Amino acid sequence: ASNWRLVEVGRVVLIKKGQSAGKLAAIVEIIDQKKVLIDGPKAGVPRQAINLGQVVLTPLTFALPRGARTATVSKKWAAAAVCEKWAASSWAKKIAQRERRAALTDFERFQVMVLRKQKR
Amino acid sequence: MKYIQTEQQIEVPEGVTVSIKSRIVKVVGPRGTLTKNLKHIDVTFTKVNNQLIKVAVHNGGRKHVAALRTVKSLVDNMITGVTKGYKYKMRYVYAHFPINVNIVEKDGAKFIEVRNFLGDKKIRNVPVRDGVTIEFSTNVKDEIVLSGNSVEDVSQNAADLQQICRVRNKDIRKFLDGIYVSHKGFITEDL
Amino acid sequence: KAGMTTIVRDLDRPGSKFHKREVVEAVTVVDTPPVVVVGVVGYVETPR
Amino acid sequence: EPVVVIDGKGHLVGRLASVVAKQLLNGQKIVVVRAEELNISGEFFRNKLKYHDFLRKATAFNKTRGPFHFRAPSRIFYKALRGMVSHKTARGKAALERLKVFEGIPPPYDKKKRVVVPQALRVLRLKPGRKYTTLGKLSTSVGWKYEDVVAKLEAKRKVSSAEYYAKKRAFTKKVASANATAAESDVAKQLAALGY
RNA sequence: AGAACUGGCGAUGCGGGAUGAACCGAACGUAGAGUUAAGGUGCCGGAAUACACGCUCAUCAGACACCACAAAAGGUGUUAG
RNA sequence: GCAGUCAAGCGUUCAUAGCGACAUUGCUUUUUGAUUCUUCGAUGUCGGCUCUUCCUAUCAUACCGAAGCAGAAUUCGGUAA
RNA sequence: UUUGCUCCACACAAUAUAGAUGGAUACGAAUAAGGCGUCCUUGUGGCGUCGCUGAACCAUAGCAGGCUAGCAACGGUGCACUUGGCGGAAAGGCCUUGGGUGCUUGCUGGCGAAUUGCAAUGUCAUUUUGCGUGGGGAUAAAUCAUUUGUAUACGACUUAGA
Numbered sequence: 001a002s003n004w005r006l007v008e009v010g011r012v013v014l015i016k017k018g019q020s021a022g023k024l025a026a027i028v029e030i031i032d033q034k035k036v037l038i039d040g041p042k043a044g045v046p047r048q049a050i051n052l053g054q055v056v057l058t059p060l061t062f063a064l065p066r067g068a069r070t071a072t073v074s075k076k077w078a079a080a081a082v083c084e085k086w087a088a089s090s091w092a093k094k095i096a097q098r099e100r101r102a103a104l105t106d107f108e109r110f111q112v113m114v115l116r117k118q119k120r
Numbered sequence: 121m122k123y124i125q126t127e128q129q130i131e132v133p134e135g136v137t138v139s140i141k142s143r144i145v146k147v148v149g150p151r152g153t154l155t156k157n158l159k160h161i162d163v164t165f166t167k168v169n170n171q172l173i174k175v176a177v178h179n180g181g182r183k184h185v186a187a188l189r190t191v192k193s194l195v196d197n198m199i200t201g202v203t204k205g206y207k208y209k210m211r212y213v214y215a216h217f218p219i220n221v222n223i224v225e226k227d228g229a230k231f232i233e234v235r236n237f238l239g240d241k242k243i244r245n246v247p248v249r250d251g252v253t254i255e256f257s258t259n260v261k262d263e264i265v266l267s268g269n270s271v272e273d274v275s276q277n278a279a280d281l282q283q284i285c286r287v288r289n290k291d292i293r294k295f296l297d298g299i300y301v302s303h304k305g306f307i308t309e310d311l
Numbered sequence: 312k313a314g315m316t317t318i319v320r321d322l323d324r325p326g327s328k329f330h331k332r333e334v335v336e337a338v339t340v341v342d343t344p345p346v347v348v349v350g351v352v353g354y355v356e357t358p359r
Numbered sequence: 360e361p362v363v364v365i366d367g368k369g370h371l372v373g374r375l376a377s378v379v380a381k382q383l384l385n386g387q388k389i390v391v392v393r394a395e396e397l398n399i400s401g402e403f404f405r406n407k408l409k410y411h412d413f414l415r416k417a418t419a420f421n422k423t424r425g426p427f428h429f430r431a432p433s434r435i436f437y438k439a440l441r442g443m444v445s446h447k448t449a450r451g452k453a454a455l456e457r458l459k460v461f462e463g464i465p466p467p468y469d470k471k472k473r474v475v476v477p478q479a480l481r482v483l484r485l486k487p488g489r490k491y492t493t494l495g496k497l498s499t500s501v502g503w504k505y506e507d508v509v510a511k512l513e514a515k516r517k518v519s520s521a522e523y524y525a526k527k528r529a530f531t532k533k534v535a536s537a538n539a540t541a542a543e544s545d546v547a548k549q550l551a552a553l554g555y
Numbered sequence: 556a557g558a559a560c561u562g563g564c565g566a567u568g569c570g571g572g573a574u575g576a577a578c579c580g581a582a583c584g585u586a587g588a589g590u591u592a593a594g595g596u597g598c599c600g601g602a603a604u605a606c607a608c609g610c611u612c613a614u615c616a617g618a619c620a621c622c623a624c625a626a627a628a629g630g631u632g633u634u635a636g
Numbered sequence: 637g638c639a640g641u642c643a644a645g646c647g648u649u650c651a652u653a654g655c656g657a658c659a660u661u662g663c664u665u666u667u668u669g670a671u672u673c674u675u676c677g678a679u680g681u682c683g684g685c686u687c688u689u690c691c692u693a694u695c696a697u698a699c700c701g702a703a704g705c706a707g708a709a710u711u712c713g714g715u716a717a
Numbered sequence: 718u719u720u721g722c723u724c725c726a727c728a729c730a731a732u733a734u735a736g737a738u739g740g741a742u743a744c745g746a747a748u749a750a751g752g753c754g755u756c757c758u759u760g761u762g763g764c765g766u767c768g769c770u771g772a773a774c775c776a777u778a779g780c781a782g783g784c785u786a787g788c789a790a791c792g793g794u795g796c797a798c799u800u801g802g803c804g805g806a807a808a809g810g811c812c813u814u815g816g817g818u819g820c821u822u823g824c825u826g827g828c829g830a831a832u833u834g835c836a837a838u839g840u841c842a843u844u845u846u847g848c849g850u851g852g853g854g855a856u857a858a859a860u861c862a863u864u865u866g867u868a869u870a871c872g873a874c875u876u877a878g879a
Contacts, residue, residue, distance in 0.1 A: 053608095080768095085769085105548060113536060115794090119792080139760070159749095288699095295707085381598065384600095408614070456735085481748095511806070519745070521744090531754080
């Protein structure tokens with residue numbers, strides 16, 4: 001995360017070039033330090049903690065950073081994954097007497113659409 | 121010692137079109153259309169830039185770069201296969217017996233069939249470049265000028281004959297003939 | 312496994328040795344009884 | 360699953376070999392046919408120079424019982440697994456009596472099909488340059504035959520056409536019918552829960 | 556084939572070394588549980604197809620002690636000096 | 637016994653076509669020599685005759701490469717059992 | 718065996734066994750590339766589209782709509798039996814139709830106990846050995862031991878003369 005050796009949770013990862021889709025990219029979630037998601041948007045870009053193999057954190061460090069990685073991104077960091085992740089989390093739900101909620105919940109959407117897949 | 125950037129520029133000329141995508145790559149234009157199945161697993165030919173078509177082999181070394189150029193060239197002489205002209209010219213030195221540079225042949229035309237090398241017998245007959253128009257003579261000498269658009273194919277016919285013409289017990293040199301090769305041969309154009 | 316008896320025909324080998332000459336070779340001839348497609352049908356199709 | 364069909368597809372011999380007789384010796388009854396193309400590491404001439412030993416390396420030679428030198432492409436994956444699990448440890452004898460690597464491409468199976476990840480490659484595993492075979496072409500060269508199979512899979516693929524087309528449709532329609540319910544009160548509920 | 560200390564095998568099992576008097580660990584009453592030596596952890600087979608930075612591409616290799624083998628010479632193969 | 641490096645020499649002109657002193661690295665286990673481990677508290681010699689079967693350090697046959705290879709006739713070498 | 722008999726649909730007792738007692742859920746190909754959608758003549762274009770089976774459906778509070786029942790509203794769902802059609806290098810697969818079984822809803826009613834309804838807990842499937850009511854052939858066949866030799870040491874092999 002600068003690159004790869006860096007800092008915090010809302011600050012501190014630069015990057016970019018080489019391979020096939022790069023540019024000064026920063027630190028997202030983590031596994032503490034066991035599987036980050038090291039993206040600049042970039043203006044549109046993945047991430048990960050592949051990674052560390054040569055370059056590293058473009059221009060500055062700290063602050064300067066903190067003064068950006070959400071001074072534009074984060075907000076933006078809400079595409080799929082972004083959204084398609086959070087899901088995989090409330091996967092861990094009250095699923096117990098929240099199942100039946102889930103169940104009876106879905107079991108209704110069945111006929112709703114299953115019906116339509118027909119009358120058409 | 122493992123450069124991350126190496127790239128070269130393949131320079132399409134007006135009236136060509138490279139269809140290079142998928143793995144493979146085909147160039148149309150002037151004379152027509154040829155295609156080559158480049159999997160020298162690396163390159164990522166690309167891109168646009170108008171002129172232009174750049175090659176490149178990101179983060180590697182050895183061949184990877186080596187290949188890089190071998191590629192430019194390969195698809196480059198390609199880009200000329202329709203642009204300009206094939207276009208080679210074998211030349212055929214006789215002995216004290218003479219040769220026979222005729223174009224047969226069978227279910228589809230084998231030939232050239234040459235007869236009597238260094239006073240030989242036997243039916244020397246060798247498949248004709250399916251892509252090359254193999255015109256013997258002119259004005260003139262004994263030279264089967266036969267060229268096309270597959271520079272590759274052109275060559276290995278040209279040659280295929282000039283090997284079908286042998287010499288097997290005379291440690292060459294003196295008894296030293298064979299239907300050899302001449303100019304090479306971007307023809308025709310020049311100016 | 313019918314029988315063996317001798318021919319004698321002229322050796323139009325006309326390549327050499329005894330071209331258009333006697334030559335007395337021996338034949339072994341089998342009983343051929345023009346056999347009749349009892350049942351018939353067939354077989355086929357394969358990964359063998 | 361509970362009877363596993365691994366499409367030879369890619370996946371380098373020895374590896375999809377290990378994976379097998381593990382999952383096998385611990386008894387999860389696999390059926391991995393497609394074997395036709397199960398790439399081994401190394402150019403033909405080499406792996407080929409090898410097999411040209413190998414059984415052919417065979418011998419015995421009091422009188423050809425021993426090193427029964429087999430050919431297939433299929434019974435190659437066996438030669439593998441068949442070494443990698445205890446081939447006369449009756450346990451095995453059983454655990455083996457449960458593998459099913461069939462010589463391309465389908466048949467009675469023909470439905471299911473599961474790729475064995477990182478025993479995969481030339482794709483995932485190997486670099487990135489230089490040297491496969493085609494589990495059977497080493498055999499083509501040691502002498503199958505033949506392409507009757509690869510042609511009978513010309514067919515298989517012919518058929519798969521139909522299905523995959525339909526399912527592109529049935530699905531197309533499906534979601535192009537339940538995207539109404541999506542956005543439907545009684546659903547942004549199965550959202551919040553299935554997705555805050 | 557012969558000497559010299561020190562261990563050892565002969566008198567000894569046990570775990571490593573596939574395999575085996577003298578190698579390594581480790582000395583044995585009978586049992587339960589726990590850690591480990593040496594050795595090992597794709598698969599036979601317990602143990603990660605762990606995690607790192609490179610090097611090697613027609614037989615390149617994968618041998619602490621051993622019939623366990625392999626030199627001088629040379630390469631615009633590629634790697635750093 | 638068999639290959640190998642260095643190149644002073646032969647090879648009339650030239651070190652390596654073809655060979656190579658000196659010096660030096662090795663492979664070989666159908667010589668021979670050492671050694672005494674196994675077998676006298678059962679192993680019968682040499683040679684042939686017969687009959688497979690393997691090795692390649694190939695004499696012949698297959699295709700090729702060099703030659704001080706004009707043809708022929710030889711030599712050297714490679715793939716090859 | 719005196720045809721004594723053997724092969725299909727509902728039962729009845731013994732057997733055993735590589736180890737389900739929620740689903741085995743189908744594109745092909747690339748990977749220095751792909752997948753979907755999408756408006757096109759095509760290998761195009763152009764958004765969009767997605768890194769993860771931690772899926773997807775489908776669940777019987779692992780006997781909910783689990784037993785017995787009652788509705789309005791849906792014509793959707795799925796189960797079993799049947800025929801019209803069709804596609805399978807065999808099997809299985811898709812379809813058409815009607816009869817019939819169960820369900821999405823606050824719908825409504827009654828049922829669940831003893832410590833043998835969080836342990837045994839339904840059950841697993843498939844082995845033919847035989848013992849039962851309708852359905853099909855029909856007694857088919859092979860041996861033994863008698864014949865030159867196409868065959869033979871014995872076996873084995875080949876075949877007729879009414």
